[PDB]
Scaffold this active site. Sequence first.
Site, PDB file in Angstrom:
ATOM      1  N   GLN A 141       0.823  -1.207   0.000  1.00 60.50           N
ATOM      2  CA  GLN A 141       0.000   0.000   0.000  1.00 60.50           C
ATOM      3  C   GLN A 141       0.858   1.258   0.000  1.00 60.50           C
ATOM      4  O   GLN A 141       0.533   2.232  -0.688  1.00 60.50           O
ATOM      5  CB  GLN A 141      -0.951   0.007   1.194  1.00 60.50           C
ATOM      6  CG  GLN A 141      -1.954   1.147   1.174  1.00 60.50           C
ATOM      7  CD  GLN A 141      -3.082   0.942   2.160  1.00 60.50           C
ATOM      8  OE1 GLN A 141      -3.013   0.072   3.027  1.00 60.50           O
ATOM      9  NE2 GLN A 141      -4.134   1.741   2.030  1.00 60.50           N
TER      10      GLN A 141
ATOM     11  N   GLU B 186      -3.391  -7.272  -1.918  1.00 55.56           N
ATOM     12  CA  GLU B 186      -4.733  -6.956  -1.492  1.00 55.56           C
ATOM     13  C   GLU B 186      -5.398  -6.000  -2.488  1.00 55.56           C
ATOM     14  O   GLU B 186      -4.729  -5.159  -3.093  1.00 55.56           O
ATOM     15  CB  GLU B 186      -4.669  -6.324  -0.093  1.00 55.56           C
ATOM     16  CG  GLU B 186      -5.881  -5.537   0.365  1.00 55.56           C
ATOM     17  CD  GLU B 186      -5.538  -4.480   1.390  1.00 55.56           C
ATOM     18  OE1 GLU B 186      -6.334  -3.533   1.562  1.00 55.56           O
ATOM     19  OE2 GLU B 186      -4.456  -4.581   2.000  1.00 55.56           O
TER      20      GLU B 186
ATOM     21  N   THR C 162       2.689  -7.174   2.633  1.00 54.05           N
ATOM     22  CA  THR C 162       2.840  -6.920   1.204  1.00 54.05           C
ATOM     23  C   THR C 162       4.095  -6.109   0.927  1.00 54.05           C
ATOM     24  O   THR C 162       4.817  -6.374  -0.039  1.00 54.05           O
ATOM     25  CB  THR C 162       1.622  -6.179   0.665  1.00 54.05           C
ATOM     26  OG1 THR C 162       1.511  -4.917   1.323  1.00 54.05           O
ATOM     27  CG2 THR C 162       0.361  -6.955   0.935  1.00 54.05           C
TER      28      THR C 162
ATOM     29  N   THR D  52       2.914   3.095  13.244  1.00 52.28           N
ATOM     30  CA  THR D  52       1.507   2.832  12.965  1.00 52.28           C
ATOM     31  C   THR D  52       1.199   1.339  12.962  1.00 52.28           C
ATOM     32  O   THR D  52       0.042   0.957  12.759  1.00 52.28           O
ATOM     33  CB  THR D  52       1.072   3.435  11.620  1.00 52.28           C
ATOM     34  OG1 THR D  52       1.708   2.726  10.551  1.00 52.28           O
ATOM     35  CG2 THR D  52       1.415   4.919  11.527  1.00 52.28           C
TER      36      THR D  52
ATOM     37  N   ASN E 131       8.553   8.488   8.173  1.00 49.33           N
ATOM     38  CA  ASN E 131       7.363   9.322   8.133  1.00 49.33           C
ATOM     39  C   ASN E 131       7.544  10.600   8.946  1.00 49.33           C
ATOM     40  O   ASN E 131       7.277  11.707   8.458  1.00 49.33           O
ATOM     41  CB  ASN E 131       6.172   8.525   8.666  1.00 49.33           C
ATOM     42  CG  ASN E 131       5.853   7.318   7.816  1.00 49.33           C
ATOM     43  OD1 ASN E 131       5.982   6.182   8.271  1.00 49.33           O
ATOM     44  ND2 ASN E 131       5.462   7.546   6.571  1.00 49.33           N
TER      45      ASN E 131
ATOM     46  N   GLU F  90      25.815   5.173 -12.016  1.00 52.75           N
ATOM     47  CA  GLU F  90      26.802   6.002 -11.349  1.00 52.75           C
ATOM     48  C   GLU F  90      26.451   6.274  -9.886  1.00 52.75           C
ATOM     49  O   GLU F  90      27.349   6.252  -9.030  1.00 52.75           O
ATOM     50  CB  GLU F  90      26.938   7.284 -12.166  1.00 52.75           C
ATOM     51  CG  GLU F  90      27.959   8.274 -11.728  1.00 52.75           C
ATOM     52  CD  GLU F  90      28.020   9.469 -12.671  1.00 52.75           C
ATOM     53  OE1 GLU F  90      27.233   9.493 -13.641  1.00 52.75           O
ATOM     54  OE2 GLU F  90      28.830  10.393 -12.448  1.00 52.75           O
TER      55      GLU F  90
END
Lengths: 116, 428, 428, 433, 433
Positions: D11, D64, D138, D172, D199, D247
Amino acid sequence: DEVHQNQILRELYLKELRTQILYTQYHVNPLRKVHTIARKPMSWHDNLEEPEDARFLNLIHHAAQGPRKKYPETQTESQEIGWDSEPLVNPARDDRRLNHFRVYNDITLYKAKMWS
Amino acid sequence: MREIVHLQAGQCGNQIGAKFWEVISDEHGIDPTGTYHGDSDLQLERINVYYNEATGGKYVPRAVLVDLEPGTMDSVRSGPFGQIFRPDNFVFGQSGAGNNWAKGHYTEGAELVDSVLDVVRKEAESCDCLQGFQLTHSLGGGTGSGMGTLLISKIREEYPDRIMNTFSVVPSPKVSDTVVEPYNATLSVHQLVENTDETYCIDNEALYDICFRTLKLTTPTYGDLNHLVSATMSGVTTCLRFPGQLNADLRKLAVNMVPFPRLHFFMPGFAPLTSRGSQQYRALTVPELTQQMFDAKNMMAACDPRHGRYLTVAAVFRGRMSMKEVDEQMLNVQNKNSSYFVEWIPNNVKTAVCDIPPRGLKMSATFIGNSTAIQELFKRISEQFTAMFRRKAFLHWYTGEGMDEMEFTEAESNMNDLGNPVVTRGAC
Amino acid sequence: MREIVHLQAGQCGNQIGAKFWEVISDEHGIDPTGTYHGDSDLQLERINVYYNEATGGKYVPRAVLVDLEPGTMDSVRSGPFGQIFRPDNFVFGQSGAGNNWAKGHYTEGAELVDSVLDVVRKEAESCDCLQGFQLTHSLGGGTGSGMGTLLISKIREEYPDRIMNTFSVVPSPKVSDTVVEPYNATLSVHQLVENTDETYCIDNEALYDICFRTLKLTTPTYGDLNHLVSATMSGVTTCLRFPGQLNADLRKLAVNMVPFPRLHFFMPGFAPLTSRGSQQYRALTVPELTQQMFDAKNMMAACDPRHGRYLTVAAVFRGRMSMKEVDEQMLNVQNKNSSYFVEWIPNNVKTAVCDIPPRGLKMSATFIGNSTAIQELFKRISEQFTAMFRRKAFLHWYTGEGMDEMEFTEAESNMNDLGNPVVTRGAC
Amino acid sequence: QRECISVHVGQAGVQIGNACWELYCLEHGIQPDGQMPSDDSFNTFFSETGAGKHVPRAVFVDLEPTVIDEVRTGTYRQLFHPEQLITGKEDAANNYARGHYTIGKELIDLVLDRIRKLADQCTGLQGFLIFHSFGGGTGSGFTSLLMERLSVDYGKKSKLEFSIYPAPQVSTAVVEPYNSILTTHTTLEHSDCAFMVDNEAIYDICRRNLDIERPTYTNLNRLISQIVSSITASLRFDGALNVDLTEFQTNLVPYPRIHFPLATYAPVISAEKAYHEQLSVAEITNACFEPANQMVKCDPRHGKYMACCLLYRGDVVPKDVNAAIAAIKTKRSIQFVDWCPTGFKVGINYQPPTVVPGDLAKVQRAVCMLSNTTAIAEAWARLDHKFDLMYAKRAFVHWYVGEGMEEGEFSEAREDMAALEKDYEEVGMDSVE
Amino acid sequence: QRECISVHVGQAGVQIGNACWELYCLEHGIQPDGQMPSDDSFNTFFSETGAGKHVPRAVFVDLEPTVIDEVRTGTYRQLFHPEQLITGKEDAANNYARGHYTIGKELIDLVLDRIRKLADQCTGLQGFLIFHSFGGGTGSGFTSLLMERLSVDYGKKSKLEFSIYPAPQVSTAVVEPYNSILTTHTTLEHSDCAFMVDNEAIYDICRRNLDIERPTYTNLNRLISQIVSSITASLRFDGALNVDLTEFQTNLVPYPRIHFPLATYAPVISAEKAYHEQLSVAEITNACFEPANQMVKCDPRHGKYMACCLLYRGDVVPKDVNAAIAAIKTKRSIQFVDWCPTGFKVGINYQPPTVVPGDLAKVQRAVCMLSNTTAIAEAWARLDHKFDLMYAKRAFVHWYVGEGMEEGEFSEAREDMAALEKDYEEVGMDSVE
Ligand SMILES: Nc1nc2c(ncn2[C@@H]2O[C@H](COP(=O)(O)OP(=O)(O)OP(=O)(O)O)[C@@H](O)[C@H]2O)c(=O)[nH]1
Ligand SMILES: Nc1nc2c(ncn2[C@@H]2O[C@H](COP(=O)(O)OP(=O)(O)OP(=O)(O)O)[C@@H](O)[C@H]2O)c(=O)[nH]1
Ligand SMILES: Nc1nc2c(ncn2[C@@H]2O[C@H](COP(=O)(O)OP(=O)(O)O)[C@@H](O)[C@H]2O)c(=O)[nH]1
Ligand SMILES: Nc1nc2c(ncn2[C@@H]2O[C@H](COP(=O)(O)OP(=O)(O)O)[C@@H](O)[C@H]2O)c(=O)[nH]1
């Protein structure tokens, strides 16, 4: 005694249910505390183009609008400074007859790019 | 696309399943008659998670409504959403309940439950990839326990790769509507523990406490008492019916949310609950949701969370909303509630955000909690059971149906054996 | 941004804060229902100080309303600006304080202080910066004295670095409305001295002298006698509500007004106060404002400064004016009246100038005093206490509710200890 | 002519591709439908197909549904090839076992066939831009299986992960320091380079610079899209110094074991702030090396840089670049390794950074500073500290054991990452021999 | 080229700074916003962003809001960079210990970061003009905390302070003497030159010369703005004598300790008063050395002048100024020290001061007089006396000691004040050897 606690709460709910007054549909928004989200870039949840608020459109422009062309007085002692910010009768100050500003010549053109 | 097969055992299970279908048919835009009248096309893009598509453009729920007494099916079909169910799944039965577990698990519950299996396997198989089942039932009393535990035991063996959401009404300490209820509760826990993957215990006392202390109702009726539960139900299963960011299914919640194979007993919470008077007085935002989420009044199992450390906590949000207020405020909850969270599991709070909230709201948040405070249900059934069986009364019924004395003793041993790991995790 | 959370105890302080809220909502331009019908945007610049924002511009006072008898809260709900508070903030109590400090501190009041702490806490964290708490109570009589002395005792241990503004109506020279006001007052001052940072003693007969001798009013009642007090706590927190010039908030005042940690008992006063008939003959300028604010007939406490020495003087001016007159007459009062000011603290006048004035004027002045003339007020209740305590009268219920004579003795000894410092400051 | 294939896995990868392709389409002239109104330019990311369309060189894959069906529903539907987008049937559910071992086998065949088919119409292939997370199943297990298969099948080709690092403080997910620790055991030998983004750094950057108090993942993914836009810009347009993925792979990675660099974007100014800075190249370079615009929450002052490349895009005078580099190399706050004196790259491109309707402003100079530092030792120790306690008494392990994965590979995951920490402390020491 | 950074700490700092920038904008030609309506001179104060926007080299800092919210609401909100204006969330509450010890660390790093950014953007950093007061906690303690950090960073740079001295008869706070003694104790060793501007002499000169009865602080502050505009004018303008910022500094101090000059302004007259005398250079000089127009309320007759810098602006014939100095040196009323006969330092600037719409007169000549005198010793001695008197029995000390300050720092300030007062008379005594 729960049988009496529930009765006194029930009397209370009868109090606000017979005397509660609704907020009468005005939505006065403050003009100084607004912060928003950003929508997803391709999606069918969003990009459906809801219409705007024209009152908000000209109201933000009314808030970002200057104190002079805002308040037709001098509301605070801080609005005394910078109020009549237009100059006086024409300076005509590009006449170097009585005007002595510095001017950047080629030595200082070359010099401003030194060291740094 | 996935499916869910949704089981109703007992009067309580049938009623809360009916309220479930009421609330999610409101969310999905289907009338009493089955015909779709919605506003957004996002509401039927995954309509086939709870609803079998049928010819004529009308969609019918994928559920079975099983009770051993033939009155509650008539009540449901005479309810507001009565002409919505498949009459093939209206599994009635002509016998006597007698709020009994032996009369549902060693007796004509056995002859009814294979017909239940016959009628549930049809929609359990007419699927592409079903993820599992939601059995709605109650430990206290019969049918929902007697049919329920045996049905769980059969379906878990026969479909061994499916998540088992069994939402179960656990007893209240102040009341119970059954005297033989400690026997029913301890004989249902034994079947529930090595079977279900996600069982959610809801306690009727804490269901009533929201209606006065939080919702500020006047005359709370069982419709509203089930309505809060059904709101939690739609909150638990929302990423699969409505899309968004950090989509959470039953498997992703389970692998996050049950740590050990035995520690899968859960305590839920729904917490944009506002009084009718104070709704205008609210300033509805996400940090204001989280305080009500983790407050000790919106948790629907009668347990004070201060009596034990949370093992794991899940939060599933609904509504279009930025995630700084999720992520940072989850960190604020975990930081100030430091001793109420375990030290051996760092960062033990999950996250899901769906874009569309429940209708009539703007933000929603359903709370899922696994802690060590399951003692205040389990020891608080155990003392009644041991003082309830040491006298060996209320027992001749059970041993006359086909029960014997010994498997009561192993049922008690296993049920208090559950306490020991969920004691030791409290003190590490 | 800065804020003050408003604690409102008793019946006296209940109506004090009630009349405070109409005054500052009229200052900010707020409809009774909570709508902003304003004229200037400087009302909405700094409105997040007493009025928490909700959706739709629903502004709610950040006040909590505590009273052990549930009739005064019914009165303030039925009042004009009554449908504006949080109903959860209306903390009720189903008992009788009965004008007893023992029943306001060691009883059902102490059973309710946990809920009061919960709601004042929930008001505290839903922000970022706390300047402090402003409570209104009665120093003489029950409830609010007991509520104040228990509530500040809990809040000082909870938040130990914030400002306490205790607005108290001291017991009264000519009359008094409860036989045990000296009993409540002495051991209310006993908790007030080591707890609170800024204390406003307002004398009732001083208020009657202002409404009759100066205001020349015909039939004043508790409404307008309450309003005079409302103006003099609206004045002090104004540089933090409106854009200011040499602006001064509560700590800015407290640091330069209390010299010693225990001499934090003050003398409020608001004085562009004119008789109705003589309002037309008034010549409103800073000098005549200065004459009237330093004239001791508009003083909120019946303590003549001619009977003692000033320690510190504060003047929270508000309005549109020049200010050589402000400073040259803060010089001129010091030069003209020299014996009434202490020589160990010279140039002892704080001045602040908020620029936005109250509605009805365009200059106001909240005069604040700390003098040695608080001592006649402290003594007279001390000898009233000794006269009532020598024969051991009006005291059997106070002992029966869970106190001993030792606490009363320590209270009298602590005001005898307060007999020392500001007396020694009187003669340097 | 000079193309690289973009794979978006999980996701997080699907959503950062969701930002990057809409940014690329505004960079170039491609409309939502796929048609350009009317030289070479587009070929590297957009393949021309006869009718007028510019179909992506992309494989959006996720185990999913419900995240790529919105690509198959949304505004940019006519742009993507209707079989480039691949979905499975059910969630892999934060489980590396469900990402790699049992439910990976019906999808790996199809996705590798789609990679082969996309690479069939590819003449000069520099490599693969794989976009994923160190979080869910995933993003971790399927990424691991993909890079194992890609090392089997395209073994010489360059691979660049743009990994979503787990949040060090807040998180999370709860089984991220299991899934991350396994995916960084397995993709370690197979990944040529792993540009690394968390994040909370974007959270703080948007808080303190863009002045947005609640940005969302659309706002995060847009700045990640600008990072990947600047990194793949010299193989899009013409400039003074031209620098490519081979490179970058050669010179940002000093050792076969240490291939984990970090980004930093320059001006992230927010429209009503860009009238007040000069936006000079010097201060743009300094803002990258300030330890407050850093793309991951690790302290560069708590470490030493090994090599950095500076990708100046826009109107960049070709010698302000090394005026700024000479300014940086003299400061005693930015400490470098003593075994790499020459460690800088300059890549100058004439194309100004584009802007989509959003938060960033029209900037005429920008640099994505990419540095390989030792400060990731702190981040790896901080993530391993989550792992030792949770593996100490076998928490969460029953899903992994019962879902085909064998229990004992957590042991060499721990051993391998202890070896990575040992490699970091061996490369960070000052030379004394 | 030649520029100085104006940093304004305290509410007084913000308000005199508002007066300064209001005067500078109309002096240059800059509009209320950053724009230039339809040459070098801006460079001293204003930088040049493209399309005519000019950004001030101003750092407006206060521990408390509403005085910066003042600025961000008024008609100069577009002029400043909004992140140059730095606000706290808690007022210093008239306490040196709060300004220096408890609330200093939430802002000192950000203020130094902004000063570092401006110093990098500035080519030739000639010096700093700090604007504070010897009064309240915000103007005292944070300026004190600023001094050691800024002297550690930029110890080779020049420092001019503009401070509001505590008033001789009125004052405003009860702890102005405490904060004054503490801030001069800490800033004595690090300040380079500090122009004292006492508050009450402003009132007296505005009552007498201006003939005005309603001036507020804005009117009192525009005089100080004219003073500093005259001070840093030859750094910007053409003239006969080009006085420089290091030249002010090397002249106004005799010793490494004596760095408190007293300034005053000539033509302080008010338009419907200047139609009635010369304003000729002799009277221009004499009105400065009249004990009725000095900006600090102390009478120089009980004192001895050390050195005086005169800065004339306008139509100033360079030899009539020599005539005026020759005339004023022979007067017996004005007395100098016996170790400095050459005392009057001429600075000549060619164009007249620009008038703000208000009370001051547009006058074709104006000198600002900068005297280092021993008459300030009595003001320092009375502040010392007041500190002894109110420190006799620990009055107003519990707040300061509870807010992190240690008790003996008061005694250290007192002892260094006794040392400073001793040094005054030791340098003021006539030599006899
Ligand atoms: N930019 C961006 N990052 C995301 C997004 N969603 C998730 N992430 C990152 O991914 C982490 C968890 O999501 P993933 O690891 O991608 O979960 P997953 O790969 O889909 O695996 P499952 O949960 O099993 O479906 C979060 O901590 C984020 O840091 C997104 O929508 N945009
Ligand atoms: N020209 C001018 N002088 C001022 C102004 N405000 C205050 N002053 C002078 O400054 C002295 C004290 O002001 P400050 O030191 O700035 O107060 P502060 O720094 O805000 O300190 P706090 O009281 O803690 O907030 C007063 O005695 C005034 O004489 C102003 O607006 N303009
Ligand atoms: N939430 C909810 N609980 C219910 C409802 N109906 C019954 N219950 C609970 O079910 C419990 C007993 O039901 P039970 O004995 O199992 O009924 P049976 O299945 O017919 O034997 C009672 O304590 C009720 O609280 C309902 O509609 N909603
Ligand atoms: N200013 C003001 N004072 C009031 C008002 N109402 C009552 N009081 C004073 O409050 C005093 C009684 O308070 P008290 O009995 O101690 O309150 P209780 O302890 O809660 O019962 C009386 O002497 C009144 O003078 C009002 O509305 N405004």
